[PDB]
Design a protein around this ligand. Structure first.
Ligand SMILES: *[C@@H]1O[C@H](CO)[C@@H](O[C@@H]2O[C@H](CO)[C@@H](O[C@@H]3O[C@H](CO[C@@H]4O[C@H](CO)[C@@H](O)[C@H](O[C@@H]5O[C@H](CO)[C@@H](O)[C@H](O)[C@@H]5O)[C@@H]4O)[C@@H](O)[C@H](O[C@@H]4O[C@H](CO)[C@@H](O)[C@H](O)[C@@H]4O)[C@@H]3O)[C@H](O)[C@H]2NC(C)=O)[C@H](O)[C@H]1NC(C)=O
Ligand SMILES: *[C@@H]1O[C@H](CO)[C@@H](O[C@@H]2O[C@H](CO)[C@@H](O[C@@H]3O[C@H](CO[C@@H]4O[C@H](CO)[C@@H](O)[C@H](O)[C@@H]4O)[C@@H](O)[C@H](O[C@@H]4O[C@H](CO)[C@@H](O)[C@H](O)[C@@H]4O)[C@@H]3O)[C@H](O)[C@H]2NC(C)=O)[C@H](O)[C@H]1NC(C)=O
Ligand SMILES: O=C(c1cnc(NCc2cnccn2)nc1)N1CCC2(CCOCC2)C1
Ligand SMILES: *[C@@H]1O[C@H](CO)[C@@H](O)[C@H](O)[C@H]1NC(C)=O
Ligand SMILES: *[C@@H]1O[C@H](CO)[C@@H](O)[C@H](O)[C@H]1NC(C)=O
Ligand code: NA
Length: 461
């Protein structure tokens, strides 16, 4: 059993913004301008045989808001248990034109539609957690099935910097929907860096596939959307449908269809202002049983290199301990606190004016989000000056004939990333061993930007 998956990268029409909140008529007009574009992708995906389509986070109204400017865009989204086809019973829950339009899009195209809209929940001064506003406002994913029925409603648990227009639910929402093409879980953007509900869906609810609306801002070398989202899919052994906003000026680009063994389709484009529809087949019930012990090999072996010139280098505001790679081939070990990283490599050639380093990081990230990390990275330094190792490098010339990366990870949640020049994924050029080694299966098809083992220590957050 296989199915055809679809994701759409969306160049959104953002509201003029801001000063005074718009009328419900003006908010609806804007939302319908974005929905007209999404209708275009949904109908094409359905005409091309897709079983499900994911659209991005904030694709219908953007991200520039305060609590009051957002309010006119909001709908009261009922509990999916209510058993409702908004297309077949338009006024069951009052004025809900966005829900009705999404339901009709799913129903008329006989396709599952995943979209991200806004939920309004009015509350009384009686409950202590009710905002002084008189309502809760949630960043919400909605899922409509092939018949137009509301089958999932998910309120974003992990809010990003400046998402003050939204509230956090009391308890993390573990939202799943079952189909004839596998069990599905759902979360949004920043949720991918946290345990709840992301890890819970996979390890406890045993989902086959994650549907993921996102408005991701690319942060090289480790947090580029295609790179990190496919790594997370591989580390969690799940299918992953990443639908991202298309906005190059904010570094937003990177949608794909990821399988547990490799990426199946991906899109990165910083040049045009156009959206993109991606389609690809996936196994409905992929194997989830390919277990990895991430510290195994690394904890067994002794330091590959001795007495070396180690330097501190900044990677996304985090101070890594690096060791420059010297020679077209080598074996290095670098440690930072509780983490020891090992690399075995062989380059295709010793390209001039291009420096590579092996970095180690064990610590808490605090800039624009608080999360505990353990990272082992083989990265292309921006220039030849070692104080540029860890800075965003979009191009490289060095192809690798072989690599083997591993670390003494104090966690079972490690995401294996392989990124080529210029933000290209490498499918299926690498694998992960049961021992915890990220290794090449072939010489890389393009020059290497990074080979990273990105680990999360959720308990140390
Ligand atoms: C979400 O929806 C899914 C899909 O509907 C639900 O999963 C289904 O659950 C049913 C109830 O437990 C399962 O039915 C039983 O199936 C076995 C036969 O084994 C299966 O053979 C199938 C055909 O060859 C195959 O599709 C199926 O799935 C596969 O399982 C293997 C491991 O074995 C795995 O590798 C694959 O990834 C895939 O999962 C099995 O191989 C029957 O023996 C069994 O007996 C009957 O009980 C009936 C009463 O329930 C009775 O009518 C009858 O007389 C027998 O006594 C059931 O028919 C079904 O296999 C399973 N399907 C899948 C794809 O998982 C899932 O439960 C839902 N989840 C939630 C949370 O709601
Ligand atoms: C993934 O793979 C790793 C590697 O195998 C697993 O980690 C190992 O788990 C072992 C338990 O199954 C640990 O063994 C214990 O070690 C204790 C202390 O040993 C020191 O630990 C360092 C690492 O921190 C090692 O280098 C050295 O071995 C040190 O000496 C011992 O106290 C403990 O002893 C037991 O005592 C009882 C009696 O009370 C005896 O009956 C028993 O036979 C045994 O002697 C035990 O040996 C091992 O340290 C640990 N290694 C590391 C590096 O963490 C992971 O747990 C696997 N992960 C998953 C999720 O499966
Ligand atoms: O959740 C996110 C979001 C989360 N992470 C990233 N990039 C990785 C990363 C991780 N930690 C720190 C910094 N960067 N990009 C976007 N967004 C939600 C909507 C949103 C629209 C742009 O303006 C702001 C708010 C971004
Ligand atoms: C769906 O079809 C019904 C009639 O079959 C129509 O009323 C509705 O406007 C359609 N909606 C969309 C978005 O295609
Ligand atoms: C690196 O280690 C491997 C395996 O032990 C070995 O075959 C290779 O020759 C080593 N290379 C260097 C330059 O140390
Ligand atoms: Na805001």
């Amino acid at each position: 059993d296989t199915f055809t998956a679809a994701v759409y990268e969306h160049a959104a029409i953002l509201p003029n913004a801001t000063l005074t909140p718009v009328s419900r008529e003006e908010a609806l007009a804007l939302m319908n301008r974005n929905l007209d574009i999404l209708e275009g992708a949904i109908t094409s995906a359905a005409d091309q045989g897709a079983h499900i389509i994911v659209t991005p986070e904030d694709a219908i109204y953007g991200w520039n808001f305060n609590r009051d400017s957002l309010y006119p865009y909001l709908e009261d989204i009922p509990d999916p248990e209510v058993n409702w086809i908004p297309c077949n019973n338009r006024n069951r829950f009052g004025q809900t034109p966005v829900q009705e339009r999404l339901s009709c899009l799913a129903k008329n195209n006989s396709i599952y539609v995943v979209a991200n809209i806004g939920d309004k929940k009015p509350c009384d001064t009686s409950d202590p957690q009710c905002p002084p506003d008189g309502r809760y406002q949630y960043n919400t994913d909605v899922v409509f099935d092939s018949q137009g029925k509301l089958v999932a409603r998910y309120h974003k648990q992990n809010l990003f910097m400046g998402e003050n227009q939204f509230n956090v639910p009391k308890e993390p929402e573990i939202v799943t929907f079952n189909t004839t093409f596998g069990s599905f879980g759902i979360f949004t953007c920043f949720d991918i860096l946290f345990h709840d509900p992301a890890v819970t869906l996979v390890k406890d609810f045993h989902v086959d596939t994650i549907v993921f609306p996102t408005a991701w801002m690319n942060v090289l070398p480790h947090l580029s959307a295609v790179e990190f989202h496919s790594a997370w899919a591989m580390g969690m052994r799940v299918n992953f449908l990443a639908s991202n906003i298309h906005y190059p000026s904010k570094k937003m680009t990177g949608s794909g269809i990821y399988a547990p063994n490799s990426s199946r389709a991906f899109h990165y484009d910083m040049k045009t202002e156009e959206g993109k529809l991606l389609l690809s087949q996936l196994d409905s019930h992929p194997s989830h049983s390919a277990v990895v012990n991430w510290t195994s090999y690394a904890s067994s072996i002794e330091a590959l290199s001795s007495g070396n010139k180690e330097f501190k280098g900044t990677v996304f505001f985090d101070e890594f301990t690096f060791v420059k790679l010297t020679g077209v081939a080598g074996n290095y070990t670098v440690c930072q606190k509780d983490l020891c990283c090992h690399l075995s490599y062989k380059m295709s050639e010793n390209i001039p004016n291009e420096v590579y380093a092996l970095g180690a990081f064990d610590g808490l990230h605090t800039v624009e989000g608080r999360y505990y990390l353990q990272i082992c990275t083989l990265l292309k330094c921006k220039t030849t000056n070692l104080n540029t190792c860890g800075d965003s490098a979009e191009t490289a010339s060095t192809r690798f004939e072989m690599f083997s990366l591993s670390g003494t990870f104090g966690t079972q949640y490690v995401f294996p990333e392989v990124l080529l020049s210029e933000n290209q994924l490498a499918p299926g050029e690498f694998q992960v061993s049961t021992d915890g080694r990220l290794f090449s299966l072939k010489p890389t098809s393009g020059p290497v930007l990074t080979v990273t083992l990105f680990g999360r220590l959720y308990e140390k957050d």
